């Protein structure tokens, strides 16, 4: 209704202005778990208000808005972390005061496995030299796409427009037609890996549930219950 009526630069500045802030945090197993889950809960609140600014997201009904966020919240959370940790190789920047190691991931059962996947993604972003304008596009794509199948013509229109926006950035960067196709493909293939980390992260999160280690906030348990 309104999102389709933007230029790509209007689309980019819309996304860049809506960017959530970088939060801070306040090691044993339960201690590091308390930190990360508390951080995730606070980041979740910002994401929701960020989601309400992604062009065309408001045009969807409240139920569909809920579904998409229920499906992609851990993905969006992860691609943000991967983006922060971009210029801290071998490390994950959960917060400016919380920079973690692959070795520190061994403080929690099965955490190190997901750490390496996150580290590998951050390394990949560094290798591709991902731009901030490209980052906010992918993050928006995940929001609109990750839950669009488990239900639409409008969401695809918005999705197609972000694709146009992505290409505009690359063509602006002086890339040949071929380089644009390949880079576009390279980017969207990452989202397949990010989905994989989300699902692996989802069940690991669920294993700390039931088998209680640290209590989880009600908002966090709600998002976690959407995935069975």
């Amino acid at each position: 209704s309104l999102a389709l009526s933007l230029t790509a630069d209007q689309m980019v500045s819309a996304l860049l202005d809506a960017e959530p802030p970088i939060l801070y945090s306040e090691f044993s197993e339960a201690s590091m778990m308390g930190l990360l889950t508390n951080l995730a809960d606070r980041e979740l609140v910002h994401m929701i208000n960020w989601a309400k600014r992604v062009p065309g997201f408001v045009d969807l009904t409240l139920h569909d808005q809920v579904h998409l966020l229920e499906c992609a919240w851990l993905e969006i959370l992860m691609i943000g972390l991967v983006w922060r940790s971009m210029e801290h190789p071998g490390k994950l920047l959960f917060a400016p005061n919380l920079l973690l190691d692959r070795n520190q991931g061994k403080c929690v059962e099965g955490m190190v496995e997901i750490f390496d996947m996150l580290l590998a993604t951050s390394s990949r972003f560094r290798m591709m030299n991902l731009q901030g304008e490209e980052f906010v596009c992918l993050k928006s794509i995940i929001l609109l796409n990750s839950g669009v199948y488990t239900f639409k013509d409008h969401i695809h229109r918005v999705l197609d427009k972000i694709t146009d926006t992505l290409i505009h950035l690359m063509a602006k960067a002086g890339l040949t037609l071929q380089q644009q196709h390949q880079r576009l493909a390279q980017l969207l293939l990452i989202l397949s890996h990010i989905r994989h980390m989300s699902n692996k992260g989802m069940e690991h999160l669920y294993s700390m549930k039931c088998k209680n280690v640290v209590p989880l906030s009600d908002l966090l348990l709600e998002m976690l219950d959407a995935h069975r």
Partner: peptide, 7 residues
């Protein structure tokens, strides 16, 4: 749900 209220 609380997610509704935030939205």
């Amino acid at each position: 749900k609380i997610l509704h209220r935030l939205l």
